[PDB]
Amino acid sequence: PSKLALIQELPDRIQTAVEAAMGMSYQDAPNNVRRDLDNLHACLNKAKLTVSRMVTSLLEKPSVVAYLEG
Amino acid sequence: PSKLALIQELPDRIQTAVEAAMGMSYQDAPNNVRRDLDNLHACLNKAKLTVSRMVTSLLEKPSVVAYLEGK
RNA sequence: GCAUGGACGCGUCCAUGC
RNA sequence: GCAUGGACGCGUCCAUGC
C-alpha cells in the first residue's frame, strides 16, 4: 500500500482495534464498575477522535500530501 | 473471547492498527513534512500509551476484574 | 491523607498548516 | 487570527490501592 493510504487508513484501522471492546455490554455490572467501564469507553473514544483529527490535519497540509505521493 | 480477554487484547489490537504507518520511513522528506510526521508518531505513541495505562489501571482494580471474569 | 489511572476545564510553551 | 498535535503547570470529577 502507498504511504498516502497508510495514513488515510489509520482512523479506520483504529476504529477496528477498538470496536470490540466498546461494543460489549455491561448492563449487569455494579455501579462502581459501570463507571470504570464507562471511563474506558471515554478513553477509547478520545484516542479514536484524536488520531482521526490528527490525520485530518495531516491531509490538509498540501506539503505533507505532496510528499506522501510525490 | 470473554469480556476479560476483550479488554486484555486492546493494547495489542491497537499496536496492530498502527504499526504499518509507524514503520513507514519519511527520512527522505522535507524538514517541515518530517516534523509533522514526527508529531504523528508522537501522537500515536501517546494513544497507545494512554490505552495501555488505562487497561493496566483497569485490570488492577479487583472490583472490575471480578466482574469481567464472572465471579 | 498518600499514590495510581482516566475524563474534563484553565493557562504557559514548542512545532505544523491555512 | 484560525486549526492539529506534543510537553508542562493549576484545578474539577470518577475509580482503585494503602
Swiss-Prot record, chain A:
Bilayer-spanning residue ranges: none
Primary location recorded for the protein, binned into one broad class: host cell
Annotated stretches, region: RNA-binding: 1-70
Keyword annotations of the record: Host mitochondrion, Host-virus interaction, Inhibition of host innate immune response by virus, RNA-binding, Suppressor of RNA silencing, Viral immunoevasion
A GO molecular-function annotation: RNA binding
Cellular localization per UniProt: Host mitochondrion
Record flagged with keyword Nucleotide-binding: no
UniProt-listed GO biological process terms: symbiont-mediated suppression of host innate immune response
Cellular component, GO, one term: host cell mitochondrion
Additional free-text comment from the UniProt record: Encoded on a subgenomic RNA (RNA3) synthesized during replication and which is co-terminal with RNA1.
Quaternary assembly: Homodimer. Interacts with RNA-directed RNA polymerase.
Function of the protein: Binds double-strand RNA (dsRNA) with high affinity. Suppresses the host RNA silencing-based antiviral response.
Family as reported in the entry's similarity comment: Belongs to the nodaviridae B2 protein family.
Entry text on domains: The dsRNA-binding region is required for suppression of RNA silencing. The N-terminus is involved in homodimerization. The alpha2 helices of the dimer bind parallel to the stem of the dsRNA helix.
The protein's name in its UniProt record: Protein B2
Organism classification: Viruses, Riboviria, Orthornavirae, Kitrinoviricota, Magsaviricetes
